[PDB]
Protein backbone atom coordinates (compact mmCIF):
# COMPACT_ATOMS: atom_id res chain seq x y z
CA UNK A 1 0.00 0.00 0.00
CA UNK A 2 1.35 3.40 1.02
CA UNK A 3 4.29 2.05 3.01
CA UNK A 4 5.27 -0.59 0.44
CA UNK A 5 5.51 1.91 -2.42
CA UNK A 6 7.22 4.32 -0.02
CA UNK A 7 9.86 1.68 0.69
CA UNK A 8 10.32 0.90 -3.00
CA UNK A 9 10.88 4.55 -3.88
CA UNK A 10 13.25 4.93 -0.94
CA UNK A 11 15.32 1.89 -1.89
CA UNK A 12 15.57 3.12 -5.47
CA UNK A 13 16.73 6.55 -4.30
CA UNK A 14 19.26 4.97 -1.94
CA UNK A 15 20.64 2.70 -4.66
CA UNK A 16 21.14 5.70 -6.95
CA UNK A 17 22.74 7.87 -4.26
CA UNK A 18 25.19 5.15 -3.25
CA UNK A 19 26.02 4.30 -6.85
CA UNK A 20 26.99 7.96 -7.22
CA UNK A 21 29.90 7.87 -4.77
CA UNK A 22 33.42 7.06 -6.06
CA UNK A 23 34.96 5.36 -3.01
CA UNK A 24 36.56 2.09 -4.07
CA UNK A 25 36.23 -1.11 -2.05
CA UNK A 26 39.83 -1.51 -0.91
CA UNK A 27 39.86 2.18 0.01
CA UNK A 28 36.99 1.64 2.45
CA UNK A 29 38.18 -1.71 3.83
CA UNK A 30 40.84 0.13 5.85
CA UNK A 31 39.72 3.76 6.01
CA UNK A 32 36.38 4.99 7.38
CA UNK A 33 34.25 6.96 4.94
CA UNK A 34 34.46 10.62 6.05
CA UNK A 35 31.31 12.60 6.73
CA UNK A 36 32.03 15.26 4.11
CA UNK A 37 31.68 12.82 1.21
CA UNK A 38 27.89 12.89 1.63
CA UNK A 39 25.66 15.92 1.30
CA UNK A 40 23.82 17.08 4.41
CA UNK A 41 20.64 16.37 2.44
CA UNK A 42 21.15 12.60 2.63
CA UNK A 43 21.82 12.98 6.34
CA UNK A 44 19.18 14.41 8.71
CA UNK A 45 16.70 12.08 6.92
CA UNK A 46 15.44 14.48 4.25
CA UNK A 47 15.11 12.12 1.30
CA UNK B 1 -9.75 1.85 31.29
CA UNK B 2 -7.96 -1.55 31.08
CA UNK B 3 -4.84 -2.25 28.95
CA UNK B 4 -6.97 -3.28 25.90
CA UNK B 5 -5.64 -0.47 23.58
CA UNK B 6 -7.64 2.71 22.71
CA UNK B 7 -10.69 2.94 20.36
CA UNK B 8 -9.85 6.61 19.51
CA UNK B 9 -9.23 6.26 15.76
CA UNK B 10 -6.20 8.52 15.99
CA UNK B 11 -3.76 5.67 16.83
CA UNK B 12 -5.57 3.17 14.57
CA UNK B 13 -3.23 4.58 11.88
CA UNK B 14 -0.28 4.08 14.29
CA UNK B 15 -1.33 0.40 14.53
CA UNK B 16 -1.56 0.28 10.71
CA UNK B 17 2.07 1.52 10.40
CA UNK B 18 3.24 -1.00 13.04
CA UNK B 19 1.43 -3.88 11.28
CA UNK B 20 3.24 -3.09 7.99
CA UNK B 21 6.62 -2.75 9.76
CA UNK B 22 6.72 -5.74 12.20
CA UNK B 23 5.38 -8.00 9.41
CA UNK B 24 7.95 -6.82 6.91
CA UNK B 25 10.78 -7.22 9.47
CA UNK B 26 9.73 -10.83 10.23
CA UNK B 27 9.51 -11.60 6.49
CA UNK B 28 13.11 -10.37 5.98
CA UNK B 29 14.37 -12.22 9.11
CA UNK B 30 13.27 -15.63 7.75
CA UNK B 31 14.29 -14.82 4.16
CA UNK B 32 17.82 -14.14 5.45
CA UNK B 33 18.17 -17.29 7.53
CA UNK B 34 16.98 -19.63 4.73
CA UNK B 35 19.64 -18.10 2.39
CA UNK B 36 22.28 -18.89 5.06
CA UNK B 37 21.06 -22.52 5.23
CA UNK B 38 21.27 -22.80 1.41
CA UNK B 39 24.83 -21.33 1.40
CA UNK B 40 26.36 -23.33 4.28
CA UNK B 41 24.89 -26.53 2.76
CA UNK B 42 26.45 -25.76 -0.66
CA UNK B 43 29.87 -25.06 0.93
CA UNK B 44 29.74 -28.38 2.86
CA UNK B 45 28.89 -30.28 -0.37
CA UNK B 46 31.77 -28.49 -2.17
CA UNK B 47 34.38 -29.59 0.43
CA UNK B 48 33.06 -33.19 0.20
CA UNK B 49 33.66 -33.10 -3.60
Amino acid sequence: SNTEELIQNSIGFLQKTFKALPVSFDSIRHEPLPSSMLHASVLNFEW
Amino acid sequence: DSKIEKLTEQNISQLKESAHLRFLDLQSSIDTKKVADENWETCQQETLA
Side-chain angles (χ1 to χ4, degrees), chain A residues 3 6-14 17-18 20-22 24-26 28-30 32-35 37-38 40 43 45 47:
Chain A
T3 67
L6 173 46
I7 284 170
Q8 267 45 257
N9 305 337
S10 285
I11 179 50
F13 157 63
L14 227 347
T17 314
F18 281 161
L21 274 183
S24 57
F25 179 78
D26 188 302
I28 206 172
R29 257 215 263 126
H30 301 257
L33 162 152
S35 45
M37 291 206 48
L38 272 175
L43 271 58
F45 303 151
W47 285 2

Side-chain angles (χ1 to χ4, degrees), chain B residues 18-49:
Chain B
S18 72
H20 280 111
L21 296 177
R22 304 199 180 182
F23 159 75
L24 209 197
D25 196 16
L26 182 53
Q27 161 62 48
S28 67
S29 174
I30 126 213
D31 183 359
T32 318
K33 83 180 31 171
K34 71 171 56 181
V35 168
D37 182 39
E38 156 192 343
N39 293 351
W40 158 271
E41 177 63 27
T42 294
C43 163
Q44 177 114 335
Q45 288 297 138
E46 145 77 21
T47 178
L48 190 57

